[PDB]
Every structure is written in structure tokens, then in C-alpha cells.
């Protein structure tokens, strides 16, 4: 099977072009290009990965399948597109090459996300895109994952994967954990949604700085996700370089391989480290 690491960014910083960049992320404000990628995931023996979209414009798309032309090391891009656009469909066809595998709206951050989704528009937008065998990258918070219960039951024409297992309020485990495992279970009781293990490090206080009972938490957060969706459904991803808030690429991996080495079959860490993003993705 194919080692991915299946949830990466890439961009030439400019500080208005990334709101989400903020205060007390210097790491962040910086180019980060696959040149800067590729010896951590060769530290990992990684042979590609996913470069996931961190802003929201048709640019971000080119730029992302720009990068990821001629170089085998990205395996595939998820992109973005204004899916609620008309245009949708021949704005997709206008993409060159055959890396781009899926679409993500950065749903988090909308006013009223449940109001988001249910919209008539961006339903016909992912209906296009679950037609077309495009995945899409579910990206919320723990207290908005009741908000697309209802749309990711609508939308079973293909692959969804919940990005960073739905973030766990991880801060806040000294209920929390209750909560959002009871969202995540009704979550996986869906065949087509899948689970990405990664984006965990940055749900701990990493301002204050990570302690090994947040390593605990998040096993538990592992454990759980598991349980709800099975060794078949879980990815890893580093969330490179978002992760360098609170971690290195090697702590990153090297938590989910200590996690995996304890609690799956050598199949099921394959599994886990790339087979299960490469058939959701339509990996070659
Ligand atoms: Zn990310």
C-alpha cells in the first residue's frame, strides 16, 4: 500500500491572504513549499501526500495542481471552488490534469454553518461533485458537528472524509470528551464518511505548550474514532505545517504510530498510513 500522508498545506505567505494566520503563530507567516515538506516526509518514509487547500479562491486550486504537476510526491489535491456557483460544473472542467481528487469549504468558519449547508446551491454543488466522484473534506468544529449531521446523510453519493476526526475540544478534557464522541459515532454510523487522525496536536493548549496528558487525551481521541469508525475508515494526515504550532512532523507521526502499533493488525496499519486515503481518494 501506498504511505500518504493525506492532509497537508502549502502556501507563499501574505499576511491579508490568510486571516486565520493570527497573533502567537509566527511559525506560521512564512512560505511553505514542498521543498520544505519533502525531508520530513522522507524522516517518515512517506512516499506522497495531499495538499488540502488553505484559503478560499479559485487561485488556491491552480496553485496547489501547479505545484503538484510533474512531482509524484503530491498525490493529489483537494481543492476549492465556489460550489454554490452555476458555473460549477464547466469552472471544474477547466482544471488540467487528473490531481485533483476533491473540494473543501472552510465550513468552520461561516455564521451559521447548519444554514451553510442546507442551502439550496451548495447542495446542488456537492450533489455535482459526489455525481462526479469528487471527494469533499468536511472541516468543523466539535460543537458544529450536529450542524452536518444532516447533510452528510443527505450527501452518501460518495466519499466524505471529516478532517481532523471532528476536533475535540482536547483544551477542555480537564463532557467534552462525552460530547463529541457521541457526535462522532452518529457521524460514522455513515458508511460513506471517513475519519482523517491528524489536527489533533493544535485542539490541545498549544499556546501554553502540549503535556503528556494531552498525549493521553488525544490516545483516547484515537481510541474513540476506531471504535466509531473501524480500522478501514481512518487516515493519517500531519496537517503540515498548521501542526508546527504545537509539534514537530516526526512528534506528529510518531503519536499516531505509537497509538497504531498498540491497537492494529499490521493490514490495518497499512491501512491507516495510506490505503484507506488512497481508495477514498481514487489514488493511483
Ligand atoms: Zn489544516
Given at each position: 500500500?501506498?504511505?500518504?500522508?493525506?492532509?497537508?498545506?502549502?502556501?507563499?505567505?501574505?499576511?491579508?491572504?490568510?486571516?486565520?494566520i493570527?497573533?502567537?503563530?509566527?511559525?506560521?507567516?512564512?512560505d511553505?513549499?514542498?521543498?520544505?515538506?519533502?525531508?520530513?516526509?522522507?524522516?517518515?518514509?512517506?512516499?506522497?501526500?495531499?495538499?488540502?487547500?488553505?484559503?478560499?479562491?479559485?487561485?488556491?486550486?491552480?496553485?496547489?495542481?501547479?505545484?503538484?504537476?510533474?512531482?509524484?510526491?503530491?498525490?493529489?489535491v483537494?481543492?476549492?471552488?465556489?460550489?454554490?456557483?452555476?458555473?460549477?460544473?464547466?469552472?471544474?472542467?477547466?482544471?488540467?490534469?487528473?490531481?485533483?481528487?476533491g473540494?473543501?469549504?472552510?465550513?468552520?468558519?461561516?455564521?451559521?454553518?447548519?444554514?451553510?449547508v442546507?442551502?439550496?446551491?451548495?447542495?446542488?454543488?456537492?450533489?455535482?461533485?459526489?455525481?462526479?466522484?469528487?471527494?469533499?473534506?468536511?472541516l468543523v468544529?466539535?460543537?458544529?458537528?450536529?450542524?452536518?449531521?444532516?447533510?452528510?446523510a443527505?450527501?452518501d453519493?460518495?466519499?466524505?472524509?471529516?478532517?481532523?476526526?471532528?476536533?475535540?475540544?482536547?483544551?477542555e478534557?480537564?463532557?467534552?470528551?462525552?460530547?463529541?464522541?457521541?457526535?462522532?459515532?452518529?457521524?460514522?454510523?455513515?458508511?460513506?464518511?471517513?475519519?482523517?487522525?491528524?489536527?489533533?496536536?493544535?485542539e490541545?493548549?498549544?499556546?501554553?505548550?502540549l503535556?503528556?496528558?494531552?498525549?493521553?487525551?488525544?490516545?483516547?481521541?484515537?481510541?474513540?474514532?476506531?471504535?466509531?469508525?473501524?480500522?478501514?475508515?481512518?487516515?493519517?494526515?500531519?496537517?503540515?505545517?498548521?501542526?508546527?504550532?504545537?509539534?514537530?512532523?516526526?512528534?506528529?507521526?510518531?503519536?499516531?504510530?505509537?497509538?497504531?502499533?498498540?491497537?492494529?493488525?499490521?493490514?490495518?496499519?497499512?491501512?491507516?498510513?495510506?490505503?484507506?486515503?488512497?481508495?477514498?481518494?481514487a489514488?493511483?
Open positions: 500500500a501506498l504511505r500518504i500522508d493525506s492532509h497537508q498545506h502549502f502556501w507563499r505567505y501574505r499576511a491579508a491572504d490568510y486571516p486565520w493570527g497573533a502567537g503563530m509566527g511559525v506560521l507567516a512564512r511553505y513549499l514542498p521543498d520544505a515538506l519533502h525531508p520530513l516526509m522522507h524522516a517518515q518514509a512517506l512516499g506522497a501526500s495531499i495538499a488540502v487547500q488553505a484559503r478560499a479562491g479559485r487561485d488556491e486550486t491552480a496553485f496547489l495542481l501547479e505545484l503538484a504537476c510533474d512531482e509524484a510526491r503530491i498525490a493529489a483537494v481543492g476549492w471552488e465556489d460550489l454554490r456557483a452555476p458555473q460549477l460544473a464547466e469552472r471544474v472542467a477547466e482544471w488540467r490534469g487528473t490531481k485533483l481528487r473540494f473543501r469549504h472552510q465550513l468552520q468558519d461561516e455564521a451559521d454553518v447548519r444554514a451553510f442546507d442551502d439550496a446551491d451548495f447542495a446542488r454543488g456537492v450533489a455535482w461533485l459526489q455525481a462526479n466522484d469528487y471527494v469533499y473534506d468536511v468544529f466539535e460543537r458544529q458537528l450536529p450542524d452536518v449531521q444532516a447533510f452528510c443527505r450527501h453519493a460518495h466519499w466524505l472524509v471529516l478532517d481532523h476526526a471532528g476536533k475535540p475540544a482536547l483544551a478534557f480537564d463532557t467534552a470528551l462525552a460530547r463529541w464522541r457521541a457526535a462522532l459515532r452518529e457521524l460514522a454510523a455513515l458508511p460513506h464518511v471517513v475519519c482523517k487522525l491528524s489536527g489533533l496536536v493544535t490541545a493548549d498549544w499556546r501554553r505548550g503535556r503528556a496528558s494531552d498525549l493521553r487525551h488525544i490516545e483516547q481521541c484515537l481510541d474513540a474514532a476506531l471504535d466509531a469508525f473501524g480500522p478501514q475508515r481512518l487516515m493519517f494526515g500531519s496537517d503540515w505545517p498548521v501542526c508546527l504550532l504545537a509539534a514537530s512532523y516526526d512528534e506528529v507521526a510518531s503519536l499516531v504510530e505509537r497509538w497504531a502499533e498498540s491497537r492494529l493488525s499490521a493490514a490495518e496499519r497499512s491501512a491507516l498510513w495510506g490505503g484507506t486515503a488512497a481508495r477514498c481518494y489514488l493511483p
